[PDB]
Each structure stands twice: as C-alpha cells, then as structure tokens.
Amino acid sequence: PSMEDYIEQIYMLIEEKGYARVSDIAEALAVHPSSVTKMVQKLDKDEYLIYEKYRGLVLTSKGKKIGKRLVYRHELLEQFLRIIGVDEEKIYNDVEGIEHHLSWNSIDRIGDLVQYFEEDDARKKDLKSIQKKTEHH
Amino acid sequence: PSMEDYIEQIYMLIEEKGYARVSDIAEALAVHPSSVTKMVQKLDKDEYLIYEKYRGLVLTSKGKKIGKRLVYRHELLEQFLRIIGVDEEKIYNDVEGIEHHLSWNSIDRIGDLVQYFEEDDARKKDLKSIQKKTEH
Numbered sequence: 001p002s003m004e005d006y007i008e009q010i011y012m013l014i015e016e017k018g019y020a021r022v023s024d025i026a027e028a029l030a031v032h033p034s035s036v037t038k039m040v041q042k043l044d045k046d047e048y049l050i051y052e053k054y055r056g057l058v059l060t061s062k063g064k065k066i067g068k069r070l071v072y073r074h075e076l077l078e079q080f081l082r083i084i085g086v087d088e089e090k091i092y093n094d095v096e097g098i099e100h101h102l103s104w105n106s107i108d109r110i111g112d113l114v115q116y117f118e119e120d121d122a123r124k125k126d127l128k129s130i131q132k133k134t135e136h137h
Numbered sequence: 138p139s140m141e142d143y144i145e146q147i148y149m150l151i152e153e154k155g156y157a158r159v160s161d162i163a164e165a166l167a168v169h170p171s172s173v174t175k176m177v178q179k180l181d182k183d184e185y186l187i188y189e190k191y192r193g194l195v196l197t198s199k200g201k202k203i204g205k206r207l208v209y210r211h212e213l214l215e216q217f218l219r220i221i222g223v224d225e226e227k228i229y230n231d232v233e234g235i236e237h238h239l240s241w242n243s244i245d246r247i248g249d250l251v252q253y254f255e256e257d258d259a260r261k262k263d264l265k266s267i268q269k270k271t272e273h
C-alpha cells in the first residue's frame with residue numbers, strides 16, 4: 001500500500017466511524033500494525049495528520065482534502081468500469097490496482113467520459129450495441 | 138518491473154532488432170543487468186523463453202503469445218487515453234502504471250469503448266462538448 005492507500009483508508013474510517021484506529025487501518029489494508037505505525041509517522045511528518053496526546057489520529061486540512069480527493073477518485077473509477085460493462089465482481093480489484101497510477105488529467109477525462117454516458121442513456125445503448133458486434137462478429 | 142513488464146519489453150526488442158540482449162533489456166526497464174539475469178532464469182523455468190548458444194534468448198510459443206497480447210494491451214490503452222482527450226505527454230506513464238493491473242474483462246470493454254468512438258466522429262465531438270461543459 002502506498003501513502004495514498006493509507007490516507008484513502010484513514011479518511012474512509014473517519015467518515016464511517018468518526019475515528020481511525022491503527023487496528024482498523026491494519027485490517028482494511030491487510031497489513032501488520034507495525035507497517036501502519038511506520039506510515040502514520042511519515043504522514044505525521046509530512047503534515048497530513050496529527051495525534052495530539054489522547055483523542056486519536058486526526059487529519060489536518062491537507063490530509064482531509066487529499067482524502068476526499070482519493071475517495072472521489074475511487075468512486076469515479078468504479079462508476080467508469082461499471083458504465084463500460086465490466087463484470088461487477090471484477091471492478092473493485094481493478095480500481096484497487098490502477099487508481100493511484102493515473103494522472104489527474106486522466107482522472108478528469110474519465111470523469112468527462114462518465115458524464116458523457118450519464119447525460120444520455122442512448123449512448124449507453126449504442127455502446128452495448130458495439131459490444132454485441134465485437135462479441136461474435 | 139514485473140514478469141509481464143519483462144516479457145513485454147523482450148517481445149518488443151525481438152520485433153525491433155530481431156533479438157533481445159540482456160543489456161538492451163536492462164536499459165529498457167532501467168534496471169541492473171544482474172536483475173535481468175535473475176528474471177530471465179525465472180522466465181526460463183516458467184517456459185516463457187529459452188537460451189541458445191548462438192541466438193541468445195528466444196521466446197517459446199507461450200512467451201510469444203503473451204508478448205503479443207501485452208503489446209496489444211499497451212497500444213490499446215494509449216489509444217483509449219488519447220481518444221478521451223488526455224494530454225499526449227501524460228499518456229505513456231499512465232499506461233505503464235495501470236496496464237498490468239487491469240483484468241482482461243476491463244481491457245476488452247475498453248476495446249469496445251475505443252471502437253465506439255472510432256465508429257462515428259459525432260461521438261468524439263459530443264465528448265468534446267461535455268469537456269467544455271465540465272470546464273464551466
């Protein structure tokens with residue numbers, strides 16, 4: 001997991017539970033707690049989050065903005081693969097593997113693509129028609 | 138560099154030069170020759186290629202089929218990012234980063250999408266109109 005992977009999951013946990021426990025981060029990323037503590041320290045140093053005494057892990061404004069961006073990117077990519085017809089079961093793992101290796105330019109263009117299809121269902125129908133061609137013929 | 142990264146580059150060198158030198162593979166993947174030798178041995182064990190006392194490394198039919206599919210995948214993804222409007226200069230690095238992490242289902246669906254736009258320019262024009270809209 002990259003730094004973006006950690007911030008993405010920390011943001012999600014804070015929104016889901018209201019806080020992000022090291023044990024919960026470790027579970028979400030399927031890694032050892034030590035790996036989390038190491039990354040958390042790096043994120044603290046880079047000012048993405050803090051840990052004032054008790055209370056707990058808290059994202060800084062910089063961490064919150066990036067986290068929101070990452071969840072947006074994840075959601076958008078799933079919608080993209082869903083719209084173009086990828087089997088639902090395969091969508092998550094694919095987004096997991098590509099999301100943090102795409103420039104913002106690509107993300108924003110994929111965003112335009114999604115809007116393109118959402119704007120007129122007729123385009124989705126024509127796309128399905130093409131899938132039928134490339135299917136047999 | 139993953140196993141697929143190596144096969145993709147080896148296939149390309151063979152198509153370009155007619156052979157894949159360890160040094161050319163190291164330069165293409167920006168890695169040390171030692172890492173190449175290690176990977177080549179793994180690829181040999183896995184039967185993707187073999188070594189010849191006079192022709193260097195040769196891909197087996199399994200390696201050739203994979204290599205061809207990898208180059209197809211790379212080219213397809215570049216065309217996809219290109220048709221949807223990504224700045225040309227950013228396309229290569231994006232494809233390099235995602236290409237070997239997409240299922241065939243996704244690759245084939247992206248293939249249909251490319252055909253969808255290549256079939257009627259009006260669709261390209263309409264996508265451009267939306268980009269102007271999302272631009273506000």
Ligand SMILES: [Zn+2]
Pocket residue numbers: 008074095096099
């Ligand atoms: Zn994600």
Ligand SMILES: [Zn+2]
Pocket residue numbers: 145211232233236
């Ligand atoms: Zn490639």
